[PDB]
Design a protein around this ligand. Structure first.
Ligand SMILES: O=c1c(-n2ccnn2)c[nH]n1-c1cc(N2CCOCC2)ncn1
Ligand SMILES: O=c1c(-n2ccnn2)c[nH]n1-c1cc(N2CCOCC2)ncn1
Ligand SMILES: [Zn+2]
Ligand SMILES: [Zn+2]
Lengths: 335, 335
């Protein structure tokens, strides 16, 4: 049920702005940061939407004109795709798969060019979509540095400490166009997802739904991404996608979503919602305890599978041979 | 083509004494130890039958009465089975598989008891078969120690040196009944197989026929043994057994067969051939070279698969989980 914006300004969004998919979902909880239930979820590495952290309060006034006037005359990475689905890939892994065709090229440019290229597609017909994805606190205008310093570092530093996490590895500014989709993938780091402008529908799946989501081979450029086309699922290749169940929410300005380490997430900017602005805070997870407590968590089994694949590629001297060897290993032996 | 025994004593054996199987074979070469081709085969880790090593010359006079009179009043391990197929298993691995039923029990006894139990089955109807399998040069009669010392240690020590092998790990005396079958398995050590009394048909398969022979899971008691019943191959479970091709020979008194590290071998004592006597010499292979030369040998890929299985069992804390994890890893990802 969409929430009502204050001052009787009407529904923040409506269901017609959400894409439709084949699987059921249930809501991620929206809680106050002072609510003990919210700490219990984070500590147990389950997602939660915090409504009142003020994590990026000073950034809530951010729009394009404000960022143009103040973000500086440096260069920002702009990713491009002809469709709504943005196909992220690892350039370092392209050699292993020469039959891989990048479906979303990347271009560096000054902020004002992104604003005009964005505005241009608007005044035109715009099948093409864009995504600005640049690390924060680097070569940025003094005014933004002020806003940046005004994030609620007290709260998030305390979280980092309580959860025993490692260092803040990255701050990332995302500016996207309506309908932009980042397909399902998982990350190895903890993520506080701070929404600033517009609305993003986030669909999360726990690590134990690995079997249902069919990630690419570790050595493939799309490592950690699901092979399933959520818009046209191939049930013969990916039969267990019919068993997937997600946790769903729509976050808006002022919301913070905790995406736990190894949780799949599918993120879409609402159709006809205008531009979205987001800042992610990525932290290295806490280190593995001395005594491994059994039974293993699902995400630890995922780590094991990754390591096995990495090891076989190193040992065989060729990532292409991993698949053949694994099949040799199980066929008529373990299946 | 069976060889003719000297002095016009007739054919050593005939085809009717060989069991019949579903796969083609071709002959292992019979060469003189002085033949350079024989050294080339051993060095390249391919099987060869050496006809004139005199490796166990003093043991060629061995029969049951001679061994009884001279082998000593100690205890020898006697394996038993109701059928011709002797199901060897690792007692240490039985816990992992409680649904495993040993089909061949083992009993210790004095040599004269084995001779009488053997003789008894003879005078009776004898579906039950026996196999004496005891390590040599331990608690043995002085006369046998003499014969033992008279093996051609010069020749085999030189082989050990040329091939850079490790130590002689074990000497094994085998006494078996006609029709005894040791089903297909592979060993991790080099083996000179010295035939003394009677005839054994040896069928070998190279390591690259792993795919066709379907070994048990590493953690199973029958580790390294083929799951295929050569007498009734299940082609639905083991489809690539239809592609297996073996190297075949019949070794008799005075012959030595080199079974290279990791080669599958199926060994049967000829039907209606009387008892067989054999001594195996097992050596640890040479150590892996500093710089791993690609492409890998087939037996190195086998080693990799073993290590992966061993590792997963340790990491998951449970061998039973290896199969499920491997399938999760490949299903819709690598197959
Ligand atoms: O970009 C995102 C993201 N998100 C948040 C709002 N909309 N999308 C969630 N995770 N995530 C990423 C993003 C990413 N890269 C970093 C390098 O350049 C391209 C994006 N790698 C892993 N995860
Ligand atoms: O027993 C044999 C054998 N063979 C030779 C003639 N007839 N059979 C060839 N290999 N082999 C074995 C035998 C073996 N064990 C040792 C421990 O007790 C049972 C047999 N382990 C591995 N390989
Ligand atoms: Zn991500
Ligand atoms: Zn063996």
């Amino acid at each position: 049920e969409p929430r009502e914006e204050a001052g009787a300004l009407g529904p923040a969004w409506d269901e017609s702005q959400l894409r439709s998919y084949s699987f059921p979902t249930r809501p991620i909880p929206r809680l106050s940061q002072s609510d003990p239930r919210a700490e219990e979820l984070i500590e147990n590495e389950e997602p939660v939407v915090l409504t009142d952290t003020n994590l990026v309060y000073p950034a809530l006034k951010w729009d394009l004109e404000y960022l143009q006037e103040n973000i500086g005359n440096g260069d920002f990475s702009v990713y491009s795709a002809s469709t709504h689905k943005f196909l992220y890939y690892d350039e370092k892994k392209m050699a292993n798969f020469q039959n891989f065709k990048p479906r979303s090229n990347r271009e560096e440019m000054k902020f004002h060019e992104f604003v005009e290229k964005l505005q241009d597609i608007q005044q035109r017909g715009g099948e093409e979509r864009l995504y600005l994805q640049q690390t924060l606190n680097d070569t940025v205008g003094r005014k933004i540095v002020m806003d940046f310093l005004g994030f609620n570092w007290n709260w998030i530093n305390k979280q980092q400490g309580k959860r025993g996490w490692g260092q803040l590895t990255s701050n990332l500014l995302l500016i996207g166009m309506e309908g932009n989709v980042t397909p399902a993938h998982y990350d190895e780091q903890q993520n506080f997802f701070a929404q600033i402008k517009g609305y993003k529908r986030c669909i999360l799946f726990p690590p134990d739904q690995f079997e249902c989501l069919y990630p690419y081979p570790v050595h493939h450029p799309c490592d950690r991404q699901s092979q399933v086309d959520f818009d046209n699922p191939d049930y013969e290749r990916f039969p267990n996608f019919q068993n997937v169940v997600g946790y769903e929410t729509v976050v808006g300005p002022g919301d913070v979503l905790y995406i736990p380490m190894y949780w799949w997430h599918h993120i879409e900017s609402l159709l006809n919602g205008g531009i979205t602005i987001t800042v992610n805070f990525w932290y290295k997870g806490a280190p593995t305890p001395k005594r491994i407590e059994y039974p293993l968590k699902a995400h630890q089994k995922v780590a094991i599978m990754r390591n096995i694949e990495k090891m076989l590629g190193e040992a065989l001297g060729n990532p292409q041979e991993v698949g053949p060897l694994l099949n040799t290993m199980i066929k008529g032996r373990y299946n």
